[PDB]
Amino acid sequence: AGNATEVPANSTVLSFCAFAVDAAKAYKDYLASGGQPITNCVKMLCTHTGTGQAITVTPEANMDQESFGGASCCLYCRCHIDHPNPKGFCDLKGKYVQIPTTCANDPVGFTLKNTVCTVCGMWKGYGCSCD
Amino acid sequence: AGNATEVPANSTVLSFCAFAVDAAKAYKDYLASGGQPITNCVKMLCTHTGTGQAITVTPEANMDQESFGGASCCLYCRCHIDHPNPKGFCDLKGKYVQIPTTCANDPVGFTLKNTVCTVCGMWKGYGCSCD
Amino acid sequence: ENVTGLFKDCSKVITGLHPTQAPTHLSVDTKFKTEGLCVDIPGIPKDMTYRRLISMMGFKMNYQVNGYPNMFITREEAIRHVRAWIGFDVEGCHATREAVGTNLPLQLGFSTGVNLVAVPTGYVDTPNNTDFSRVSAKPPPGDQFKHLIPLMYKGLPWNVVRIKIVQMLSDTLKNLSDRVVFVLWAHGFALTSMKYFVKIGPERTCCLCDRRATCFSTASDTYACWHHSIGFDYVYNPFMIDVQQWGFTGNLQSNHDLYCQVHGNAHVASCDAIMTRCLAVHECFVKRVDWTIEYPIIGDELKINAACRKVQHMVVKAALLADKFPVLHDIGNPKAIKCVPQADVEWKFYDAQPCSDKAYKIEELFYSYATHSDKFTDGVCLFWNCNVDRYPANSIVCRFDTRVLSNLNLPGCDGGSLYVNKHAFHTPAFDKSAFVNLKQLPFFYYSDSPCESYVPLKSATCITRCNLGGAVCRHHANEYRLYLDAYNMMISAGFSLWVYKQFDTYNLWNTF
Amino acid sequence: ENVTGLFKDCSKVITGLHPTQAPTHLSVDTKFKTEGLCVDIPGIPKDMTYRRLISMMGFKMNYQVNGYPNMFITREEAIRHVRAWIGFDVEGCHATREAVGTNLPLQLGFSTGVNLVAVPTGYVDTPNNTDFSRVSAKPPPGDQFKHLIPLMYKGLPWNVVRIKIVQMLSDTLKNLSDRVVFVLWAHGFALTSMKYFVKIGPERTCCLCDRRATCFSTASDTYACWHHSIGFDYVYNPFMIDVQQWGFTGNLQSNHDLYCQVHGNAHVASCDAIMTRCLAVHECFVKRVDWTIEYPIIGDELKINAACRKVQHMVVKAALLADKFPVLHDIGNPKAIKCVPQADVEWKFYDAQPCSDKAYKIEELFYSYATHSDKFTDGVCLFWNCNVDRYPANSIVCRFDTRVLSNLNLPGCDGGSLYVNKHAFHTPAFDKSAFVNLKQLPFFYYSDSPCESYVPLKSATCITRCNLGGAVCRHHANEYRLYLDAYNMMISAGFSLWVYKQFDTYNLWNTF
Amino acid sequence: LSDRVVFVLWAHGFALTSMKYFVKIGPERTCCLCDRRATCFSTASDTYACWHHSIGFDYVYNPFMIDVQQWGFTGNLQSNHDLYCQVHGNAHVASCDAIMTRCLAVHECFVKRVDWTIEYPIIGDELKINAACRKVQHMVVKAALLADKFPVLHDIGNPKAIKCVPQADVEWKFYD
RNA sequence: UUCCCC
RNA sequence: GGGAAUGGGAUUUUAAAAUCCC
RNA sequence: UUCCCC
RNA sequence: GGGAAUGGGAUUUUAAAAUCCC
Ligand SMILES: [Mg+2]
Ligand SMILES: [Mg+2]
Ligand SMILES: [Mg+2]
Ligand SMILES: [Zn+2]
Ligand SMILES: [Zn+2]
Ligand SMILES: [Zn+2]
Ligand SMILES: [Zn+2]
Ligand SMILES: [Zn+2]
Ligand SMILES: [Zn+2]
Ligand SMILES: [Zn+2]
Ligand SMILES: [Zn+2]
Ligand SMILES: [Zn+2]
Ligand SMILES: [Zn+2]
Ligand SMILES: [Zn+2]
Ligand SMILES: [Zn+2]
């Protein structure tokens, strides 16, 4: 009964981070020790002619970016745990997230380590230019 | 008790259009949002050497037409609701309806959208030679 | 198996239908099927006199259409629209003589308290069109259902029933909400009955105002809100929640009785609707107050909120001048702000848990009369909107009467009430035995401000130094009327004020 | 590609998720999948009311991170922390009627004897977040599980269950160890239940002292030990071992009944936990005492050892001086250390099992009354901490009472107990039928040292030269008090002293 | 409240079968510690007591009862009770059925009209409350008539023409 | 319909 | 696999059935 | 086999 | 009268069956 969601290659890192007090620190430490990134994300087939903004409602990937489904790029949605936001809601779920093609191998880690500039909606240090 | 007459795959749309004020609009909006058409229609077997009229007493399909029972291609006969006809009677029921082969995937929608030619007796734009 | 009970043929004819008459492939007769298709046989003429009952049981309202609202909503939206909650139950009857295999709505009950009995009516399949007509039916075979036996001969045509439903819903909800939420226990038969009086579609606007359309008329295709729904027969775009889907075991009464004792009388549709709404209110609201959820203003909430503060200021300012206690105890105040800053008295604050106040000067106090009788033996105590088992003899108490129902005070669980002013507060049942040590507070106005000037004020309740003479100025003549209106509004909203038995106005006359 | 059962979608909805809402590529519906990727179809809306139960079964805790300790320890390491062992067993219920395919914790039991019932609660993927909420569930089918049917109506919320778990663990373990080792029989559902109340991370320290952190509080983001864990709601960094991985076949009851007759009553969680810990204790300690493994001095161990030494010296000296046996058999002592070197008696030494020394210093003796009753007819036998079925009528015996449980004496297998005093000794169950030829040793003091030297002593059991006078000198008066304290400590620790029936103190009184 | 108990029943068959377990009968007795009617019996001491002195007594002695269904009712208890009352419900629970039975008896005996021919004993504080009501009524009517000087006072619901203040300058009308 | 025993 | 049980009363009609109450 | 609804 | 459901995993043999554990 029921439909499977995950692949065996994610069994360790998702079991680890679902038990930790600080799942972001746990995932960073798992990666630092030679662990492999969370796989099985939802990548979009798109024309790569979009505006290149970080989080959109449509796949808006630039030629230097790849577009993913948001719920697959959130560690807390991936481990089915509480979000550290005060409201408890997700900023990625229900949206499309554009990850640079150099960092597209680990989108879950990228969405943890980076942040979005407010005035342009770009990833800071990746396509953002306001200074 | 009783005899089951419907398939589970039709459970959603038939529950939708039964409650809707405008079932014809509701079906088209259901189709336009990614829903699958109505299945389980009655399909006739014949030599495909008929006259080709839209509605007939007997199966009279052409080479490029397939005959269906008229009760299965009327949306209101499927949803068991009021016909918007002037006296509430049905024009398809008690007759055999001719659906073009390319449109045979959604025979209910074809009967909703299309119309017949009163002076030739066949579908407008789909075989009628008077225009 | 690849079958459903939705649109099931309940007729007793052993044979199927003709290919030109059968609505689906599972409805066609066996004599016509050949290699998965159907072949026209001239030897079997089509039936022109049959009547076949169709089952309306097994609806699935899980459509995802772009411009259409969804009938079933999440629990958070129901908590938001608790003012629109109407419990709903249906008791049914079984088709017996010409058809077996479906149930028909018999008695429809709502949490408002009404029961509407309908003639057993079904959707029969005729060779021309589906006919909505009366069918033969019997009460369910059970002792628990024996009270439904007379109602088989006491029903109304559905044209009357659905117009009465729309009238009752509009008259209940027009001053509370712009929609209706149906609180159901098992939604299957509820949806089967909703098929008789509910229509859906895209969102609309009332034909006479800008409100959301809640009703639809079939005589003329017009849409209206609750306020303009006279003569309208259908409910348009309602919302619903199924309570049994919240992880419940057993039946409705077994779960209601764990939390409430004032509702009973099972298998009556109105009573089960009341039980369903009571269980939902208990499950969603009797835990604690949530200040993250805010409710819109539908009436005199602002005037009530202002009048409560005005009375709380004036009563304490008069009491601290009447007897001049050196120290007072303020209990139940959410935040550490004294009602009268100008008072030369030692305020000491106590509460079970403050509303995240930074000032941690409030002491812990989980009050109970048998435990804290010696806690506040000296000085005047303050219990403003604090609910305890019993108050001591030296208190000043404001208590909300849960027996006063209004637009702000909805019915609650186990005799309590849901007071919705700006948030939702569930208040336990009112008990007068908690006021054995106190007396009802009289009305009086007090002020010390200087004044300078259609009948002038002539009342002995205006305790002012201006009133010591033979006349009172127009400033106090207007402010006394303002405070009289504020006090009247506060006591009309359901608030009762109690003071210690030694209180009197004469000492206030000595404050000048 | 293969899939795993972890995070399985147990909901009964036939379709998949939107590409913006699916957490993985397997969750997205087949509408959008194309060429190994996904497509954003413009017309299809995303679901906003779905409630998808997620399976927490299938965790793998085989991570290897530098700062993070591992939960599953080896049995060589668990033997060193036997004082932290707590058996743990969970009973479960099956999700039903809104989701099928996962099991939820219902009854949690521990070797301490407690059982905690929780309401069936699961993790539900919602379009905003993951909601930890009560879900529909049923007990498993089968006769053996019928006693789980009443437990569906008496569960507690999980926020209370984990508070009670932390309280019980801290109360049991605050005077035994600085950690917890969970003794499990099948770690699958044990881990699935530990998801509800266990947190992991790097090694921390208590907020109020320098002890290891064993508990975590979400309400304050703080860590505490067992002594300071009041109000804490999670167990932080626990350890565990699976006994079934040690090569067992069959079920737990089958393997436990091979060695133990005391425990039973399977399928109750606390009883199964007791059986699991009993089986682990049997597999680790019933074989033989391992002198290579030492244990920390938790409390009063050195005092009890000194008391035992003093009592043994006094009673052996008194017996040898009073009755003048020709030969003393120090049975069960591999060392030739004489407790009284100057006694005019020859000494023989034996061992119950052969030691590593192959010299002829000691002789083998597997004593039983049915085979060695007449081998030591003459002289006296010193049965100090040697367990036999029955003792001869000429013995001085010290025997531990396994029914006196303490911090130094833990429950063992088949009625015995595991006594941990610098080493772990498993002692068989105490029976009073082994002392039918002996009598309880009276408390007394004897002095043979010279009497060269504040309340005067007035007890007649002080067999000394200065007792034959007005008062006992303050040297012996305090030494008698020290020996009385040692005797009381020793006999409170669980040691019982027995002597041959013809022992009398009067023969000592003729020595002076 | 009283010196006896009257059990209000709906079907006295199983009620009597249950009363076999806890009811004793006999000639009329008196309490062992006072001159009140005996309502309880103790088998452990063969003594009789009233309600005030029945600590530890195990039987109800000489009770009375009435069967309401013998008053001409047809159908079940819930059917007849629901014709007049909407407060009580929850049938087949014994306390709820007892409440419904007593409610139906009260409706059949007292909701019709007040019977002035039947008098009841003064159990407590009734005369004080009557005098207090008289004094309060006199004071408030006198104060209102002196303050506002109404031309006519309508003593609605009082069949007697007894003026609570005879000297008031006002005309009086009386109704029933 | 329900229960007990194996 | 073995086995047991399915309450009490009233009324009417022709031992049985029906109705009603508990 | 079990539960819910009538 | 209407309807729903009957958990998880491992191993072996030829998708299915069997065995074992929970
Ligand atoms: Mg009901
Ligand atoms: Mg177990
Ligand atoms: Mg009863
Ligand atoms: Zn997220
Ligand atoms: Zn920027
Ligand atoms: Zn039609
Ligand atoms: Zn034409
Ligand atoms: Zn309007
Ligand atoms: Zn209630
Ligand atoms: Zn003034
Ligand atoms: Zn500490
Ligand atoms: Zn054991
Ligand atoms: Zn001495
Ligand atoms: Zn008496
Ligand atoms: Zn009543």
Numbering used by the authors:
A (entry chain A), B (entry chain C): 1 to 131
C (entry chain D), D (entry chain B): 2 to 454, 465 to 523
E (entry chain H): 177 to 352
Copy the relevant paper text.
However, the efficacy of remdesivir is limited by the unique proofreading 3′-to-5′ exoribonuclease of coronaviruses, harbored in the nsp10-nsp14 complex (hereafter referred to as ExoN). pmcRemdesivir is a broad-spectrum nucleotide analog (NA)-based drug that has emerged as a frontline antiviral during the COVID-19 pandemic. Once metabolized into the active remdesivir 5′-triphosphate (RTP), it competes with the natural nucleotide adenosine 5′-triphosphate (ATP) for incorporation into viral RNA, causing delayed chain termination and halting RNA synthesis. We reveal that remdesivir incorporation destabilizes RdRp–RNA complex while enhancing RNA binding to the proofreading exoribonuclease (ExoN), facilitating remdesivir excision.
To reveal the molecular details of remdesivir recognition and excision by ExoN, we determined the cryo-EM structure of SARS-CoV-2 ExoN E191A in complex with the T20P14-R RNA. The cryo-EM map was refined to an overall resolution of 2.8 Å, with a local resolution of the ExoN active site and remdesivir-binding pocket approaching 2.2 Å. Compared with the ExoN apo structure, the active site residue nsp14 H268 shifts 2.0 to 2.9 Å toward the scissile phosphate and adopts a catalytically competent conformation as that observed in the ExoN•standard RNA complex. Similar to that in the ExoN•standard RNA complex, ExoN separates the +1UT:+1RP base-pair and flips the +1UT out of RNA duplex. Proper positioning of the 3′-end remdesivir in the ExoN active site is mediated by many interactions with key ExoN residues. In particular, the 2′- and 3′-OH groups of the 3′-end remdesivir form multiple hydrogen bonds with nsp14 E92 and G93, a hallmark of coronavirus ExoN substrate recognition also observed in ExoN•standard RNA structure. In the ExoN•T20P14-R complex, the hydrogen bond between nsp14 H95 and the 3′-end nucleobase observed in the ExoN•standard RNA structure is lost, potentially due to steric restraints posed by the 1′-cyano group of remdesivir. Moreover, the 1′-cyano group of remdesivir projects between nsp14 H95 and N104, forming two hydrogen bonds with these residues. These additional interactions provided by the 1′-cyano group of remdesivir likely compensate for the loss of the nucleobase-mediated hydrogen bond and contribute to the higher ExoN-binding affinity of T20P14-R than that of T20P14-A.
